[PDB]
Specification:
The complex is a heterotrimer of chains A (186), B (220) and C (213).
Chain A lengths: L5 H5 L14 E2 L7 H4 L6 E5 L13 E10 L13 H5 L7 E7 L1 H4 L58 E10 L10
Antiparallel strand pairs in A: 1-3, 2-4, 3-5, 4-5
Chain B lengths: L2 E4 L11 E3 L1 E4 L7 E7 L6 E6 L6 E3 L7 E6 L4 E6 L6 E8 L14 E2 L5 E3 L10 E5 L5 E11 L4 E5 L9 E2 L3 E2 L5 E10 L9 E6 L4 E3 L6
Antiparallel strand pairs in B: 1-3, 2-8, 4-5, 4-9, 5-6, 7-8, 9-10, 9-11, 12-13, 13-17, 14-18, 15-17, 16-17, 18-19
Chain C lengths: L3 E4 L2 E4 L5 E7 L8 E6 L6 E5 L3 E2 L7 E6 L2 E6 L9 E6 L10 E5 L7 E5 L3 H5 L2 E11 L4 E7 L2 E3 L3 E5 L9 E10 H5 L3 E8 L6 E6 L3
Parallel strand pairs in C: 2-10
Antiparallel strand pairs in C: 1-3, 3-8, 4-5, 4-9, 5-6, 7-8, 9-10, 11-12, 12-16, 13-14, 13-17, 15-16, 17-18
Classes of the chains: A mainly beta (186), B mainly beta (220), C mainly beta (213).
The complex binds a molecule of 3 linked components (NAG-NAG-FUC).
PDB class: viral protein/immune system
Keywords: SARS-CoV-2, GX/P2V/2017, RBD, antibody, S309, Fab, viral protein, VIRAL PROTEIN-IMMUNE SYSTEM complex
Assembly: trimeric
Amino acid sequence: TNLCPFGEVFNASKFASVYAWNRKRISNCVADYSVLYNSTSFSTFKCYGVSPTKLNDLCFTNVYADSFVVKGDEVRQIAPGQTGVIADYNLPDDFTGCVIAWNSVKQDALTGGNYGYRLFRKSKLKPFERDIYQAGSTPCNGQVGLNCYYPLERYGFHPTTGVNYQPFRVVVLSFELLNGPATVCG
Amino acid sequence: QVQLVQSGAEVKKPGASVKVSCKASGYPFTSYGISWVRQAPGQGLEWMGWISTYNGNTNYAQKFQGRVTMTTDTSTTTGYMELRRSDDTAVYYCARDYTRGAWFGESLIGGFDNWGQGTLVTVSSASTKGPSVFPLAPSSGTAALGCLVKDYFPEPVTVSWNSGALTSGVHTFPAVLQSSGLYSLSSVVTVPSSSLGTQTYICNVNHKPSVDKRVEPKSC
Amino acid sequence: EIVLTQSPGTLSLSPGERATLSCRASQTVSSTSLAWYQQKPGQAPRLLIYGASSRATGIPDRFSGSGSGTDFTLTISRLEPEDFAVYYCQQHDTSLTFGGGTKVEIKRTVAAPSVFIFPPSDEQLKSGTASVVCLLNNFYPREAKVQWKVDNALQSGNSQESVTEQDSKDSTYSLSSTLTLSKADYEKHKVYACEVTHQGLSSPVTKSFNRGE
Ligand SMILES: *[C@@H]1O[C@H](CO[C@@H]2O[C@@H](C)[C@@H](O)[C@@H](O)[C@@H]2O)[C@@H](O[C@@H]2O[C@H](CO)[C@@H](O)[C@H](O)[C@H]2NC(C)=O)[C@H](O)[C@H]1NC(C)=O
């Protein structure tokens, strides 16, 4: 037996930006899906495409674990078929997998302001893509000036803000089931 | 309820290396990493390195870059530690790591939990020698007498009075490293001044890797 | 590196008081990569807090940690008899660095020591090495002044003092200063004395013996 490293994915000290999330291929292991189901340390925990309770006794070829940080009210944009700043710029309607989001004020928001999303893009992001801005006729040559600006506003996170204005860490469980050999079930 | 058990105390000379085993039982051995911390006597904790039980990658401390070697066996759930001096005489601890991750290698939310008992490693060019017990006698309402253990190596020694009957007032002092190179230790006890003339006090000294001494009142 | 500086080095509070142990970093450590460790004397380190605020499984409620940025604090709300140990702070933001430690000592009313000096035995003198022992019995606090006077000459160096741990009976220490001298060097002087100055002594206590008497 060789347990899957879901502990170090959910318990990673520092995550990445929403525009630069880290896809994490997890395979060749055994996943105890009951840990995620019965932790109670998760603000939001929902999905479709697979039975959440009976997901334990099913295996797939590989497991993909997205990981990024968004605001409290922006957790709605991490669902299939959603419109928003994060959804359209930073999951397909046939997504089979679960999205797990929890509160991370004490770890991403500091008293002085850690300040460690993408606001502008000509084309909306196609599913499972990740992008790492001309707003007029003026073809700016690389100077962030008139009608041209940086496409990245840094997040502002402090413990003083409200529930939906606070940082949230999101892990998306993306199960793929290609015709290869499945290797991850408990 | 996981426990980590290390190897017994092993002493060396300032030559070759010492190796410490560390077997764990109670958690998936390949799910959590192992870390090592060194603590010299009378000092604090000094970190040594880190190892991954899944991939085998090692993150040694800056001091031991080129000296320490760490390996783990996936089968016996045992982690090994080898340091290729008298400056390194310390107690080597073995602990379960939750700060670097076993599979990937990223910093985690945690510390070190379920430490081992610590393997006592002493490096000195000395050799085993018996305790040179000498009695300290009282003279002119509480008296005092003791036994001086000198020129003995290595530690420890168990000292009791009247074969353990005298449990009050006995104070065994911590050993001190003599500048010559050997260990020295003392042990005293407080007794009433009226019982000096009608009682027998004898110290018991037990140096394991190698004595009764009467202490009569001094007259001169 | 990121250096963890703890202060004070030794803390003294009576059982029942509130303890506020602080850990200071030479840089800005992430609020997640900082752990507190408790080590009872003669035992293994025990994890108290991880993430600078989250306690390990089984750790009681009185151990609450806080802090952010460069200043961090571990607070023991109600000191207990088993809580008197040496505590450390450890950060893994940049490699790994421990702290110097912060020993938590039991505070007690000042106790006057009992001072005894033992001349080297006749058997020990026959071997060529003569060791004199100066003993302090049941004194608090730990601070004591030990000076060796041999024919009024203040001995420096060869004196070897050993301090016990705070006794579990009355929370009080003991001291043993060993003076190492050869057979011939012990024969060249007549008055051997160790001067002891403790807070509980109104005047410094000198216990002296004349060789051969
Ligand atoms: C993520 O970590 C939490 C807690 O992490 C700590 O470090 C772990 C290595 C372990 O020692 C825990 O006990 C520590 O509290 C994990 O949640 C714990 O899970 C155990 C069961 O394995 C349970 O007994 C504890 O009560 C839990 N503690 C808390 C605070 O929830 C969790 O399993 C880790 N992995 C994830 C979330 O995927």
